[PDB]
Design a protein around this ligand. Structure first.
Ligand SMILES: [Mg+2]
Length: 586
RNA sequence: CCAUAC
């Protein structure tokens, strides 16, 4: 099961890949988790002159998230002393004066905000991006980085890659299984819509859609949404891989607890709003907002569930009357009339109202023959009233700044929202300890399931990081170390492009692409045979036997077949080979 | 006649 890594030879083919994709920047490399981790695995162990910069930096980040004001008051001293003051009068500094004056200025007044050293954070990165970044690029700990990313892009998934346990869902097309990823051992809720059932109801729209919606919501580290991680399809199954949630739903917990207290409920409201916020940023409307659509985890913090009835409005406002009938806004319910975030803000009010009550807001029967009961603080009233205005520009989260308007409410007069985002606040409730034969898969219709699958770089790197990564670095470090002394390039000096591994009429060979020729050799030899660029004509990729491979046509006449180990390899091979002969022929 | 990790 364990994810074995590729060889260090990969570097050439991969670096050629990544450079064209401009991912050889401090920015993207640092912004990636595994790139960061390998950066600190690098400098803290290896290069000496950069060690402190990261130590300082790391300590800044550790600092930022101290809960109480006094824990920062203590720590602020620690850092200035050790990292700033100790290396100040010892000269170890290419920093500025003002940096410290602004720092010391705030330091002086006994005031310790979290975004304090942010100036230093910024000016730090400049010193790293320059010389140090170059030295990093050329390393075992970069050679390592490419090997991982190679995996990233060669992660394609099957039913074997998951060890399915239980079933906890049935509806529409798919069910909600629970599972463990074999690769690592990570816990995922698997939602498997069935293509046949998707075809009968003509709900292909909604299945494809859901992926998109999943795929846009899930980037950006958000805790209050059930986020996808991978998509993959079988011959007859559409799979979404989603964050597992154990503490039932709010409809069930609303039953056991009965009605909720205000201060209790306030917790959930907030959680949700931040989730909601993330969607309105990416122009999504949930429309469906409801206790049942809000799940919990073993701790007691919530997420939003079935994106399904969600829609992108960035480029075209929808006019459909979609949603759970109990929380559909005035705007939604109309022929040929459109809506946006509003709906979510409306549903929320109804939802919150229902948490503290259970009673029903809106239903159509009124005329002859929202008004609220007398169990509310005016602060609570103020909120709901504003959220549940019958009119569009009248309500909250609308005329202005969206989720910010909501946040400002005096019901949250005593509530920090950055702390909520970390989930430092105490959970109010901890959980308890728990047909279609006559259809045919038309391969004509399968063609709109091309690029259904998507691995999410953020979530995979995280997943990997937070389990194997470190132990699997020692694995290949061992393997690599135990094979170097077993043995003991032809590249540098002359003008080379690339080098890597492939096969022919199957025999594994190490190749070396020049501007004019292409050499190869067995792993105890010199350049066996060759192939000039002046004599290649047609370079296509005939991906036969369900395996991406390359077709080369020669001026001689005979065709020539090359299979690659990973896709990233083939793609970067294809490209640089075409580039070689087309100019070489001129 | 829809929903369904309700
Ligand atoms: Mg659904």
């Amino acid at each position: 099961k364990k994810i074995l890594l590729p060889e260090p030879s990969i570097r050439s083919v991969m670096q050629k890949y990544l450079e064209d994709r401009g991912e050889v920047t401090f920015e993207k490399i640092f912004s990636q988790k595994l790139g960061y981790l390998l950066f600190r695995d690098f400098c803290l162990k290896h290069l000496e002159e950069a060690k402190p910069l990261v130590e300082f930096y790391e300590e800044i980040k550790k600092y930022e998230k101290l809960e109480t004001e006094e824990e920062r008051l203590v720590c602020s001293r620690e850092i200035f002393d050790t990292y700033i003051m100790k290396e100040l009068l010892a000269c170890s500094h290419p920093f500025s004066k003002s940096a410290i004056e602004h720092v010391q200025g705030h330091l002086v007044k006994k005031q310790v905000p979290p975004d304090l050293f942010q100036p230093y954070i910024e000016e730090i990165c400049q010193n790293l991006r320059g010389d140090v970044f170059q030295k990093f690029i050329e390393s075992d700990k970069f050679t390592r980085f490419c090997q991982w990313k190679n995996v990233e892009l060669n992660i394609h998934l099957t039913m074997n890659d998951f060890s399915v346990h239980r079933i906890i869902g049935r509806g529409g097309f798919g069910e909600v299984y629970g599972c463990r990823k074999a690769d690592t051992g990570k816990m995922y809720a698997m939602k498997c819509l069935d293509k046949k059932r998707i075809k009968m109801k003509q709900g292909e729209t909604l299945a494809l859609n859901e992926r998109i919606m999943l795929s846009l919501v899930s980037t950006g580290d958000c805790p209050f949404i059930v986020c996808m991680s991978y998509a993959f399809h079988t011959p007859d199954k559409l799979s979404f891989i989603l964050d597992l949630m154990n503490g039932g739903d709010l409809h069930y917990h609303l039953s056991q607890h009965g009605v909720f207290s205000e201060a209790d409920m306030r917790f959930y409201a907030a959680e949700i709003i931040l989730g909601l916020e993330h969607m309105h940023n990416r122009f999504v409307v949930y429309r469906d907002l409801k206790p049942a659509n809000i799940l919990l985890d073993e701790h007691g913090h919530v997420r939003i569930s079935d994106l399904g009835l969600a829609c992108d409005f960035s480029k075209k406002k929808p006019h459909a009357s979609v949603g759970t009938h109990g929380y559909m806004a005035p705007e939604v319910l109309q022929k040929g009339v459109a809506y946006d975030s509003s709906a979510d803000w409306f549903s929320l009010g109804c939802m919150l109202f229902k948490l503290l009550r259970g009673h029903s807001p809106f239903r159509q029967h009124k005329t002859k023959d929202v008004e609220l009961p007398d169990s509310f603080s005016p602060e609570l009233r103020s909120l709901l009233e504003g959220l549940l205005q019958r009119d569009v520009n009248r309500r909250l989260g609308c005329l202005g700044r969206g989720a910010q308007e909501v946040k400002e409410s005096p019901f949250f007069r005593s509530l920090d929202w950055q702390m909520v985002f970390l989930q430092k606040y105490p959970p109010p409730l901890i959980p308890p300890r728990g047909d279609t034969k006559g259809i045919k898969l038309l391969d004509s219709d399968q063609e709109l399931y091309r690029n259904f699958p998507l691995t999410i770089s953020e979530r995979w790197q995280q997943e990997v990081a937070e389990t194997v990564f470190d132990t699997i670095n020692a694995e290949t470090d061992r393997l690599e170390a135990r094979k170097k002394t077993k043995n003991k390039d032809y590249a540098l000096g002359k003008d080379c492009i690339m080098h890597g591994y492939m096969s022919k009429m199957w025999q594994r060979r190490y190749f070396y692409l020049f501007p004019n020729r292409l050499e190869w050799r067995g792993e105890g030899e010199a350049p066996q045979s060759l192939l000039t660029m002046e004599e290649i004509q047609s370079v296509e990729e005939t991906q036969i036997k369900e395996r991406k491979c390359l077709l080369l046509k020669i001026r001689g006449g005979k065709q020539f077949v090359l299979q690659c180990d990973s896709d990233p390899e083939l793609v970067q091979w294809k490209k640089e080979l075409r580039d070689a002969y087309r100019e070489a022929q001129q």
